[PDB]
């Protein structure tokens with residue numbers, strides 16, 4: 316009788332990897348067509364790069380490097396502050412999935428059992444086992460334990476069996492992010508490959524072809540709006556969002572810009588936790604339900620990975 | 636720009652009526668194919684709420700209007716109690732109301748011709764700078780809406796309150812208990828005068844004889860304790876165990892039933908009473924109601940809905 320894991324982003328797959336290394340059977344659930352969550356699923360329109368400040372996470376990254384799924388990104392980075400573009404060099408080590416951000420989670424998932432396009436709506440337990448109800452009213456189960464690995468607002472629905480936990484998780488605010496991708500046939504005549512942006516609807520842009528192993532055919536750019544701007548335009552249409560963020564991009568760039576080959580927009584309602592936490596993970600070991608996610612920690616890739624590990628560590632102790 | 640109401644149980648429709656009586660347009664959503672929520676009749680069997688009492692004078696007044704309209708009747712069953720292996724008559728001084736021809740007729744009459752989207756499960760609720768918006772399970776946007784009233788069981792409301800985390804954390808602490816309900820029907824009526832029974836020391840909490848509301852069919856409700864212990868049992872097993880509990884307590888022949896159904900209510904009733912009335916973030920424009928804001932009875936849900944609408948109407952002058 317397997318462990319159910321709800322959410323196949325970094326946190327859920329990290330918990331999955333830990334449990335499977337320990338010999339246990341898992342079954343994964345995601346409402347999306349594929350895995351990866353805010354890493355994006357197999358242009359990098361979600362998470363852009365990540366850093367490793369935790370030695371344990373650093374170790375996992377070295378393992379991903381040796382498996383061929385992560386590499387270092389050293390873009391020529393700029394800053395846009397008060398109407399001025401300026402180079403902003405550093406020596407920060409930044410990692411990206413290769414050949415896209417989605418590659419890390421895809422490899423973590425591997426051949427594990429998974430039910431995609433499966434939105435869980437309820438999680439409840441009998442005297443022994445857990446059961447999941449999905450949005451098509453179908454039952455899934457039995458399961459011995461349940462790990463919730465969703466953004467906090469989406470986990471609260473799944474924690475009715477533990478209202479004290481639900482109440483804590485429901486307090487966790489997430490900020491939204493609108494993303495836009497733009498692709499040019501003629502590359503933009505700038506050496507900029509990424510930019511931290513102030514005083515603008517944008518706070519970040521990245522030049523996809525500067526990342527290792529990406530396709531060079533088009534010069535594609537990813538634009539991330541601030542949370543404040545995203546909130547203010549949360550119900551804007553994709554085409555208005557494209558137009559505004561494209562305009563912001565045209566206003567800070569130092570060079571000419573032809574018409575894009577295509578343009579995309581994507582809204583994340585629950586993109587980033589509003590603040591940081593130190594919980595690591597939240598568990599009701601008595602009932603067998605565990606909660607993890609980036610929002611249990613720093614709200615970065617590293618946080619999500621560490622949270623999934625902590626959830627699985629606690630489950631493993633109690634199994635035994 | 637209309638007010639969105641998410642849930643077409645009696646709390647949501649009560650809010651709807653109060654808002655529409657005040658001249659304000661609403662739009663109703665429900666994930667089910669029809670309205671009534673836990674006051675729903677299955678096609679006729681009351682599988683959720685069985686009867687209701689009116690103790691609040693305001694709610695009584697509404698019941699009497701419904702009664703004049705033909706949608707409720709006073710139910711006068713021969714009531715029994717089963718205590719310690721003994722079944723005894725248990726008449727009392729409480730007036731009990733039911734919908735007529737079914738418990739659903741009340742909510743159906745309240746909804747009337749109001750705008751409604753059925754089979755529409757809302758999964759996120761968020762606002763831009765101006766208006767509120769709803770996402771459904773098909774990823775379809777609904778809106779713009781001027782305000783939003785959440786009218787669902789508390790565990791189902793938390794996912795819709797992400798725009799108001801403080802409210803969300805309050806709503807999320809509200810425990811709801813499950814009930815397994817079973818309906819059975821017999822070819823020849825059971826040779827007992829009993830028409831209702833309060834049950835102790837049994838998997839069963841309650842049972843009612845349908846034909847005694849204004850084939851001999853019966854509804855059985857299990858205790859929340861037994862329901863939790865068997866929350867993942869199959870329908871056939873539930874039918875079997877609860878039919879058995881009924882055959883054990885009754886004191887006449889009970890031939891095999893000729894029809895049987897089981898229905899699980901995960902969120903049947905709040906585990907405790909509350910005194911909130913409604914919950915709200917009126918500055919943001921989101922309001923929350925349900926039976927679990929008050930007593931966990933039909934009356935509490937109705938009152939909660941009135942209270943949510945009253946709060947919203949009163950706050951308009953500050954907007």
Ligand SMILES: Cc1cc2nc3c(=O)[nH]c(=O)nc-3n(C[C@H](O)[C@H](O)[C@H](O)COP(=O)(O)OP(=O)(O)OC[C@H]3O[C@@H](n4cnc5c(N)ncnc54)[C@H](O)[C@@H]3O)c2cc1C
Pocket residue numbers: 321322323324325326327344345346347350351352353354360361362363364365366433434435436464465466469492494539583585586587607608609610614615616617619
């Ligand atoms: C625009 C954007 C840019 C970012 N940039 C960076 C960056 O530059 N650096 C960085 O370190 N981090 C960044 N992040 C954050 C990083 O992506 C996240 O911290 C990390 O990917 C979160 O992983 P997770 O497993 O906690 O959650 P998620 O990746 O959200 O995974 C949750 C999964 O659960 C699924 N799910 C949700 N509800 C249900 C349900 N009811 N039933 C079934 N499945 C469900 C979702 O579909 C999803 O797959 C960014 C995020 C966004 C949105």
Ligand SMILES: Cc1cc2nc3c(=O)[nH]c(=O)nc-3n(C[C@H](O)[C@H](O)[C@H](O)COP(=O)(O)OP(=O)(O)OC[C@H]3O[C@@H](n4cnc5c(N)ncnc54)[C@H](O)[C@@H]3O)c2cc1C
Pocket residue numbers: 641642643644645646647664665666667670671672673674682683684685686687688755756757758786787788791814816856900902903904924925926927931932933934936
């Ligand atoms: C077995 C049982 C027996 C009961 N017996 C009695 C009794 O004898 N006396 C008594 O007074 N009370 C009884 N009750 C309680 C009474 O039924 C409730 O107090 C009252 O009906 C609750 O009304 P409500 O509008 O708050 O919620 P509900 O009736 O639950 O309505 C909520 C509605 O919201 C909808 N909804 C939920 N989530 C979403 C979503 N995400 N998107 C869209 N729509 C959604 C649901 O489909 C439902 O229609 C009983 C309940 C049960 C289950």
